[PDB]
Amino acid sequence: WGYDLVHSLKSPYIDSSYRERAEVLVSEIKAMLNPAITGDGESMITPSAYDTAWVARVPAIDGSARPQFPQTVDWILKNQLKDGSWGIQSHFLLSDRLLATLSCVLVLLKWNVGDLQVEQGIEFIKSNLELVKDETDQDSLVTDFEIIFPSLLREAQSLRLGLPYDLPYIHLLQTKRQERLAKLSREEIYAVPSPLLYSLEGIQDIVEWERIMEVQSQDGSFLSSPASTACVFMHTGDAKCLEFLNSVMIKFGNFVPCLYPVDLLERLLIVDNIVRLGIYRHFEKEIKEALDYVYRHWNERGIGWGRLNPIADLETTALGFRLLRLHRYNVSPAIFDNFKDAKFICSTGQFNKDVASMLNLYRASQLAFPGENILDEAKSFATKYLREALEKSETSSAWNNKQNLSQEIKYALKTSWHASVPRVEAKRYCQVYRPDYARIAKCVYKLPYVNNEKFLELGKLDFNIIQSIHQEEMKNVTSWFRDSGLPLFTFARERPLEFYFLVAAGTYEPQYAKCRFLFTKVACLQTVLDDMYDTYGTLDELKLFTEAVRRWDLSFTENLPDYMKLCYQIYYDIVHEVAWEAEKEQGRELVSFFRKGWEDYLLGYYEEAEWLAAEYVPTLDEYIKNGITSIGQRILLLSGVLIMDGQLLSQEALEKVDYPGRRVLTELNSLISRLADDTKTYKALASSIECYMKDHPECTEEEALDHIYSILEPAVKELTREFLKPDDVPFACKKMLFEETRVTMVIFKDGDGFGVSKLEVKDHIKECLIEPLPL
Numbered sequence: 025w026g027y028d029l030v031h032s033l034k035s036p037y038i039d040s041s042y043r044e045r046a047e048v049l050v051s052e053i054k055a056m057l058n059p060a061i062t063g064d065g066e067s068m069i070t071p072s073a074y075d076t077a078w079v080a081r082v083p084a085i086d087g088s089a090r091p092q093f094p095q096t097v098d099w100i101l102k103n104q105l106k107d108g109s110w111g112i113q114s115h116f117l118l119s120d121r122l123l124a125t126l127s128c129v130l131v132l133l134k135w136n137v138g139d140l141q142v143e144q145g146i147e148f149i150k151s152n153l154e155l156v157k158d159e160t161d162q163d164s165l166v167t168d169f170e171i172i173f174p175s176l177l178r179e180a181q182s183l184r185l186g187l188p189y190d191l192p193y194i195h196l197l198q199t200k201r202q203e204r205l206a207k208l209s210r211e212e213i214y215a216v217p218s219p220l221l222y223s224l225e226g227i228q229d230i231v232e233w234e235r236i237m238e239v240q241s242q243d244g245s246f247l248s249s250p251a252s253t254a255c256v257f258m259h260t261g262d263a264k265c266l267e268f269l270n271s272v273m274i275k276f277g278n279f280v281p282c283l284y285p286v287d288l289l290e291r292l293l294i295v296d297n298i299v300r301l302g303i304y305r306h307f308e309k310e311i312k313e314a315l316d317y318v319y320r321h322w323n324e325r326g327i328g329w330g331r332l333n334p335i336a337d338l339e340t341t342a343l344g345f346r347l348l349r350l351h352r353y354n355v356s357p358a359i360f361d362n363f364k365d366a367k368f369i370c371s372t373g374q375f376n377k378d379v380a381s382m383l384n385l386y387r388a389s390q391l392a393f394p395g396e397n398i399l400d401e402a403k404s405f406a407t408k409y410l411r412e413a414l415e416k417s418e419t420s421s422a423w424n425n426k427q428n429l430s431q432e433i434k435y436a437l438k439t440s441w442h443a444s445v446p447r448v449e450a451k452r453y454c455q456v457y458r459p460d461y462a463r464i465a466k467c468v469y470k471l472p473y474v475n476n477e478k479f480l481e482l483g484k485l486d487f488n489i490i491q492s493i494h495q496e497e498m499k500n501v502t503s504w505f506r507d508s509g510l511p512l513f514t515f516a517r518e519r520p521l522e523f524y525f526l527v528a529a530g531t532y533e534p535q536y537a538k539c540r541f542l543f544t545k546v547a548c549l550q551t552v553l554d555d556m557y558d559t560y561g562t563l564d565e566l567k568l569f570t571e572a573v574r575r576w577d578l579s580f581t582e583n584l585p586d587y588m589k590l591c592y593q594i595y596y597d598i599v600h601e602v603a604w605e606a607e608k609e610q611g612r613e614l615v616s617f618f619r620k621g622w623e624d625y626l627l628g629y630y631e632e633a634e635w636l637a638a639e640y641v642p643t644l645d646e647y648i649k650n651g652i653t654s655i656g657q658r659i660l661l662l663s664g665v666l667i668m669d670g671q672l673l674s675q676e677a678l679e680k681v682d683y684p685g686r687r688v689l690t691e692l693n694s695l696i697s698r699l700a701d702d703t704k705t706y707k708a709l710a711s712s713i714e715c716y717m718k719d720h721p722e723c724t725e726e727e728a729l730d731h732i733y734s735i736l737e738p739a740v741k742e743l744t745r746e747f748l749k750p751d752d753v754p755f756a757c758k759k760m761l762f763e764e765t766r767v768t769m770v771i772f773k774d775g776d777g778f779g780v781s782k783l784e785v786k787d788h789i790k791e792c793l794i795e796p797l798p799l
């Protein structure tokens with residue numbers, strides 16, 4: 025550890041060639057995404073054999089005995105898999121293969137072609153249905169499988185196809201279809217758009233086609249489904265239905281996907297993945313262009329996966345809310361009212377979609393601003409939902425196990441967005457992100473703009489490069505520390521890497537080396553000062569030191585005890601080094617501002633030292649007043665935020681994020697730090713807990729701890745709003761302040777009074793700064 029460990033590190037990723045390579049990857053990714061965000065190559069999604077077979081059913085509008093879209097028949101004939109099924113070869117899902125295969129078999133029979141394909145397809149369906157022994161063998165179900173498959177299978181039965189219609193599993197599916205259809209408000213199908221519109225081809229005996237046009241999408245589709253639209257067309261001859269089918273054929277050529285368009289969801293998924301991989305800083309232009317498009321279509325009623333959906337989609341809406349707010353767009357959590365029954369109700373469609381919607385709702389709820397009760401309500405509901413989902417058999421299907429769904433849900437629930445280490449979350453996501461991830465709707469599908477090898481290649485390389493740069497900085501840090509004189513204060517533990525981690529895990533960009541270096545120096549100094557005032561120093565010694573603090577005179581130190589003479593000299597040097605660097609970056613005088621900051625901090629320590637000497641227990645009000653100042657976060661934060669390469673802070677701009685006595689970023693960070701610290705420790709003078717109990721002699725320790733949290737929770741919401749709020753403060757500065765708070769909140773998370781885990785701190789340093797990602 026310390027000097028020896030850090031100087032033993034020899035990372036290859038520091039060489040310029042690695043960054044040059046990453047820049048090639050960045051250019052390649054910009055070119056890849058260009059059609060999606062700026063061109064007309066939006067909605068890149070794999071073929072749906074199931075839907076393609078429905079489109080193939082449509083007879084020629086000229087009345088001749090052939091398909092209107094004969095290229096779809098040719099596609100089907102040429103794309104059977106080796107086992108006789110149709111679907112995506114890389115991923116096997118039973119329900120997907122069963123549905124697509126029966127769909128293709130029937131249309132080939134309709135047109136009296138592909139006799140060999142039909143024979144092989146029928147064998148696949150029969151063969152595989154007979155392997156289903158019980159419910160737990162069925163695996164994950166494609167959208168509305170229970171509704172559609174019995175219907176499609178009855179079509180086959182009327183043609184007397186050699187399939188096992190009398191299997192228990194078949195009877196069970198009909199039972200499930202009945203239980204789904206029982207909750208159906210049929211009269212409302214025609215009046216209120218609903219998820220069932222995605223699958224009209226499965227409920228043909230129920231739908232009055234003469235009334236169904238009222239809920240058609242503006243593009244002519246029925247909830248973006250080619251199959252459902254093809255069905256309505258064949259029953260109605262509706263011109264707009266045909267226009268939709270034509271538009272999809274024009275786009276894809278000789279097949280159709282199971283959803284179209286997916287313009288909103290795809291854009292959001294692209295952004296979400298780029299952000300989670302930690303590579304977002306390379307794609308500011310593309311992220312803005314993507315989210316600007318989503319925002320244009322953002323409305324009070326929510327959004328669907330495609331901009332023309334006549335009903336909103338919780339998955340896409342919750343994802344949109346979070347990403348838009350995170351990128352400083354003005355959105356309101358009142359959009360979630362669109363998904364309440366009159367509270368929430370999502371849990372009706374297919375399982376992966378429902379789980380995804382709730383994961384997204386859970387994540388969105390954590391970005392709550394003050395007074396947003398609906399998001400507190402959303403958090404509760406989603407948490408309960410996800411905990412229940414963990415106990416469901418569907419969660420442990422072969423398909424879900426292969427994708428580690430249970431693990432993903434568990435990780436989400438144990439993870440607080442506020443109490444996260446940003447660099448570590450990106451590192452962890454690089455280990456979970458799948459270039460070949462397969463999604464489920466009417467069929468299994470992929471979105472190559474979202475899931476691809478280039479994203480991951482860049483994610484791993486970029487992480488390693490940044491880390492190697494930090495490793496060189498840590499050599500500088502430990503080298504400085506060794507020669508600084510600070511190690512002479514043997515009453516204080518040496519922790520330079522812990523303090524470097526506090527800033528570097530959130531403010532990681534290469535250009536902010538000076539910020540990280542100066543922040544670390546000040547944090548090292550402060551830990552000595554803290555131990556001196558609250559432990560080592562006598563009140564009479566501290567009175568002397570505090571007088572020297574007022575004087576700003578090196579010559580005055582002749583009065584101090586030897587250890588204080590040295591301490592004062594180091595303190596004086598660090599303060600003025602930071603100030604010179606700040607003045608250089610900011611182009612204005614800042615020595616006076618820094619000096620006032622330091623004296624307020626240390627005068628705060630001295631007040632505390634007087635209390636200790638007198639065994640005085642403050643009121644909670646006086647404790648918090650003192651604590652916001654004496655905790656030292658304000659002056660530490662200032663020692664980094666004013667020296668960020670290229671980030672100009674006028675006095676006016678600075679006062680927006682730093683202003684003692686006001687609820688701005690540095691003040692809220694100070695309050696959060698003080699109180700989070702207390703909740704985590706305090707059990708291991710007097711803390712906020714103990715002060716509250718003096719104020720309330722009859723209250724229990726339990727009530728006391730609850731009270732401290734009642735102060736913390738609102739503070740965290742304010743911190744979030746202050747961070748994300750639109751203003752003219754350089755965003756890099758606000759992010760630096762916010763990210764230091766997030767890393768602090770990690771150190772103090774799950775406050776039970778027990779104390780901070782030293783082994784976990786070391787583990788965070790190992791993961792973040794020491795161990796690279798394997799390439």
Ligand SMILES: NCCC(O)(P(=O)(O)O)P(=O)(O)O
Binds near residue numbers: 701
């Ligand atoms: N900078 C915080 C230092 C403390 O939390 P610590 O207990 O010394 O870690 P304090 O109790 O002095 O406020």
Ligand SMILES: [Cl-]
Binds near residue numbers: 458460461
């Ligand atoms: Cl996968």
Ligand SMILES: [Mg+2]
Binds near residue numbers: 554555558
């Ligand atoms: Mg202290």
Ligand SMILES: [Mg+2]
Binds near residue numbers: 554558
């Ligand atoms: Mg202390």
Ligand SMILES: [Mg+2]
Binds near residue numbers: 701705706
């Ligand atoms: Mg403490």
